[PDB]
Chain length 302, copies 4
C-alpha cells in the first residue's frame, strides 16, 4: 500500500577540520549509505547538525546530495522552521530539486517559544497546500512540543500531504499503536526513530519504517525485512546482536556516531562537529569502535 | 564610566500582511523609536521575531536599519547562532555595517540541545577574538541554559569583549546583584530586559540599562533617569504609572505589543506576526490600546 | 449561580525559628486574613510551603486551621498527591473536618513523572466520587502538566464535583475565555492566581475569583469589588495602586512575601521558611516593606 | 576498601489489586531479590513508586522490610524530602531501624521549585550531621536539578557522610569519569542506575555499583563481577545477552517490569501500580515475558 517503507537513515553533515562544508566526504557518505541497502535517506535533520549550518549551506547541501543521489533512492529533506512560509519555501525548493518527501518538526524556538495546537495545525496545512510531495511530522523531544496521538492522527486525517510520522518521544511503541488506531488508512507511514533503540517493540506496534543513524544501516535493515517476512525469531536475533552498538549510539556517542564510524572506515575525512558541540571523549570513541568491530559493519570495510 | 547606558529597546520586525519584509514600515519604526528618546536600539532579538526570518532577510534588515539609523544612536545587533563560526561571522559582519555592540544567546537548539560551560566559554571567547566591539550576553529562559553569576562574571573578567549582560531569568534582580558583586567593573553593563517588568527591583540591584519593548520606550526611560539622579520616589511614581502597560505587554500581548501600538498610531502598515505565531485576541488588543490610552505614549501620537 | 467567588488567599504555614510548626502564629495569621476581608481561605497549597511539611503536620494543620476558622469563612484544603486513592482520602478527610472545597493539582511527580490525559480524567473522577464538596483544578506550571481548555471543560461537564479552576499558567486570560466558552454553566468557578499579577486582564476574561497571596487581601479585594459593580475605571485605579506590591510579590519575594509582611506587623513570630528554601535577600525584604508602606495595608497596623 | 560494592536493586512497592499495601508479597519480593544474589537492597526510591504512598505507609514499609531482611544484606533507605529537617529525621530513623545507608535526591518539588547550590550543600551537610551511616546522592532527571561533577565531588570531600553517588542523568559514563577524578578517594561509591541500560559504558568509566530494577538482578550481577575480575570481553557477552531485557524495562515496561515478572513467577500477588500510573499495555507485557522467558531468570523459577 504505502509509497515508502523500510530504513531511511539520517545523513550526517560532514565538515572539514576547519568546520567548513566537506562536500566530497558528503557525497561519499551518501554513496556508502546507499550501498548499505538503505531504502532512502533523510538529510538536514537534527541528527545532521542542521542547527549548526546556514541557509546558504542548507541549499548547497540540498542540491549537492540530491544531484549525487541521481534518483537511486528517494530522499527525505528536513525543512523545519518556525515560520510557516519559510518552511513552505524550503519544502518547495526541496521538491524542485527532486525530494520525495519533506520532514518537519512542529514550529518551535528554544525552550519557551511554543505554538498552540491550532496554529501548529495551520502550519502543516499551509505547507501541505504549497507542495505535492508527502510530509513527515517529527515527534521528538528537541521541539519541547507535545504532539499527542489524537492530534497527530487528526493532522493526518485533516491535511492532504501529512501521511508520515517519525515518533521519537518516550513510549513510542504504544504511541504508534494509538496513532494507527485513530488514523486508519490516513497513516501511510508510522515510523520510529531514536537510532532504532526501540525498533523491536515499535515493529510489534505496527511500525512500517525506521529513521536510524547513518553509521550501520546494513545492521538494522535485516531486522525490518525479517519482520516483514514473518521471521520474528530471526528479527529478534539480529536485534540482539546489534543492540549494544545501537545502545552506545543512543546513550554514549550520539549524533557523532555515524561520522566517527565513517572516519575510522575511511569514508569521510573528518568526524569533527562544528564548534561548540562537544567532540567525542576518547574513551567513548574507543568503546564505540570496539563494539562495532565485533559486528563487521559495512562502514569499516567499505 | 561605561560606554553605553540607558534604554535600548528592541526594534520589532515589520512585515507586510503578505508575509514579506516591509522595509518602509521598518524605517518608520526605527525613526519613531529614536524620536521616543531611545539611548540606543537592539535588532534581530527574539522580540524581533528573529526565529521567523531567514538569513538573507537578516542581512537585508541589518544593512537597512543600520544605514537608516545613520549613527544617530548606537545599535546592538543580535547575532545568536549555535555554531561558533556562524555567530563570529555575523558579529563581524554586524561590526562592519556599523553596529556598536552584538548580543548573543549562549549556543543552544530547541528544548534538549545544550552546551557545557567549557564550550560556552570558548563560544564567547572565539566571538570575542573575531570582533572589536563589545558583546552582550543574553541570559533568558528561551535558551534553557544555566549561566551562573560566577560563570557570567568569569567571562567578563577573562573574555575581552564580553562586558554587557541582559539578565532576564527569574530572580533577575538578585542575580544582577551577584553578577555585580563577583564581577565588579568588569560588568560594564548589568542590564535587565523582559519589557521592564522588574525594572524598579533591577535598578535597586544596580542595573544601569534596560532592553525593553519597542512600543513605549519614552514611558520607561524617565524611570532610569530619575534613578540615576537619586530621585527614587519619582522613579517609583513613573514606574507605577506605566506598570499596568508594562504588565499587559509582559503577560498578555507580548512580542506583538509594540506592533499593535505602532499600527494603531500609523507608524507601521501592519501589526501581523509571521505565521504561525498567534495573532492578538481582539479583546487582548482592545485592553492593550485602552491601557495605552491612559498614558499618552508617543507611538499613539507620532505619525499624525 | 456559583457557590464560591471573590478573593481566596493562600494561608502560609508559620514555623517557629526552630523550624517546627508554630500553631499560635498560624491561628493569628488566619485571624488577620479573615479581618482583612478574605471571602475564604486556601491552605496547604504550594504557596503554603506544603512540599516542606509531613503528612502528620498536614493533618495537624488541617484540623487546627479549620477548627480555628470555626466556620467564619469557607476553606479550600489543597489535597494534591500523585496517588488517586491518597488524594481522594485526603479530600474526604478534609470534607469531614469542615472543608467547603478541595484543590488538587493534576497527578505528577518531579520534572519527569507525568500522567496521560485519560488517567488524569480518571483521577479527578474517582476523587469526585469520594466527596460531596466541589473540586478545584489547579493549572499551574509546577505540575509540568498540560491541561488544555477543552480538557478542563470536558472534565467540568462530565465530572460532577469538578467545577472550579485556578488558571495560572501563561496566557491565563485567554485560557479562561476559552474555558468559559467551552464549559458554559459547568464552569462554576473560573479563577486566576499568581498573586493577582494579571487580575485585570483575567477579570476582563470572565474570572469570578482570585487565589492571591495571604499578605494584603484588603488591597486586592476592592479590585474585584469595583469590577463586579461595573466601576471599571475604579477597578483599574486600585489595580495600578497595588500592582507594584503585587509585582514585587510575584517576581522578588514570592512565597515568603505574606510571611515577611505578617512578621513585620507582629502577626506572626517568625517569617523563616523551612530550610533549604532560601530566605529573603535583605534588600528584597526592605524593598517589599518600602512598597507596602506606601499602601497602608492592614497587615502593618493589625497587631 | 569501600564499604559497599556490587548490585543494589530497587525493591518495588507491592500493592494489592485493591491499591492497599500487600506486605506479604513485599516480604516475598525481598526474599527473592536476596535469593537472586543482590549485594544489597534499596527501598522507597522513585522506582518503588514512593511518590504514590503516604508517610505512614513509608514507615510501615521501612520497618517491615528492614526486619524481614534480618541483616542478610545492607539496605539503602531512600529518605528524600524537600525539607532538610524532615530528610534528616527520616534518615536518623532509618539508621535506628538498621539501615546501612540512605539515598537522597537534592531538595526539589515539582517542575519549578529548585534550590541553589549553597543550600543543597547545606542540605546534605546537616543531614550528614544528624546520622552516622553513609549518604548516597541521587542525580536523576526527576529532580530537574543540575548537580555538576565538581559540585558533587566537593560535597564528597567536605561533608563526612556524602560518599556514594547514583548517576543516571544523560551522559552518566563521562560524568562518572569526571566525578571519580575530581573526587579522588572521597568517592566511596560511584554508582549508576537506570535499570543498567548503560552499565557497560558506566563500568568502563569506573562505576563500582549498580542500582538496577528488581526483576532480574541475577542476570545483571555477573556483568559487574566479570568487570571486577578484569574479564572485559565476558562483561560484554553477558551484557549483550541481557540487554534486550534491560532495554525493554528501560523503554517499554518501566517501573512495572519487576512487578510483572514477579507476578508471573508467582513471587507476588499483584503487579498493578497505584492509580493513576498507567498499567502495562497487554502487548508490552507479552513482549516482556517472551524476552524474559529466553534468559531463564530466577524470578520465573523461585522456590524458597
Amino acid at each position: 500500500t504505502p509509497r515508502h517503507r523500510g530504513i531511511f537513515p539520517v545523513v550526517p553533515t560532514t565538515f572539514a577540520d576547519t568546520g567548513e562544508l566537506d562536500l566530497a566526504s558528503q557525497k561519499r557518505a551518501v554513496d556508502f549509505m546507499i550501498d548499505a541497502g538503505s531504502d532512502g535517506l533523510c538529510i538536514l535533520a537534527n541528527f545532521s547538525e542542521q542547527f549548526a549550518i546556514t541557509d546558504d549551506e542548507r541549499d548547497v547541501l540540498t542540491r549537492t546530495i540530491l544531484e549525487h543521489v541521481a534518483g537511486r533512492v528517494p530522499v527525505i529533506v528536513t525543512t523545519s522552521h518556525y515560520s510557516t512560509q519559510v518552511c513552505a519555501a524550503r519544502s518547495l525548493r526541496a521538491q524542485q530539486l527532486g525530494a520525495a518527501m519533506v520532514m518537519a518538526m512542529p514550529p518551535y524556538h528554544g525552550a519557551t517559544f511554543r505554538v498552540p495546537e491550532a496554529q501548529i495545525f495551520e502550519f502543516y496545512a499551509r505547507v501541505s497546500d504549497a507542495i505535492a510531495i508527502p510530509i513527515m511530522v517529527q515527534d521528538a523531544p528537541a521541539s519541547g512540543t507535545a504532539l499527542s496521538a489524537p492530534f497527530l492522527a487528526r493532522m493526518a486525517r485533516e491535511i492532504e500531504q501529512v501521511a508520515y510520522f517519525k515518533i521519537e518521544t518516550p513510549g513510542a511503541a504504544n504511541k504508534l499503536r494509538e496513532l494507527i488506531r485513530l488514523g486508519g488508512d490516513a497513516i501511510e507511514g508510522p515510523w520510529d526513530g531514536e537510532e532504532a533503540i526501540t525498533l523491536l517493540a515499535d515493529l510489534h506496534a505496527g511500525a512500517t519504517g525506521a529513521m536510524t543513524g547513518g553509521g550501520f544501516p546494513d545492521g538494522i535493515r535485516p531486522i525490518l525485512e525479517a519482520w516483514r517476512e514473518g521471521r520474528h525469531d530471526d528479527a529478534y536475533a539480529r536485534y540482539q546482536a546489534w543492540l549494544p552498538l545501537i545502545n552506545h549510539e543512543n546513550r554514549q556517542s550520539g549524533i557523532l556516531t555515524a561520522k566517527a564510524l565513517m572516519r575510522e572506515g575511511g569514508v569521510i575525512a573528518s568526524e569533527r562537529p562544528r564548534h561548540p558541540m562537544p567532540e567525542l571523549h576518547p574513551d567513548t570513541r574507543a568503546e564505540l569502535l570496539a563494539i562495532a568491530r565485533r559486528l563487521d559493519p559495512l562502514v569499516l570495510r567499505w
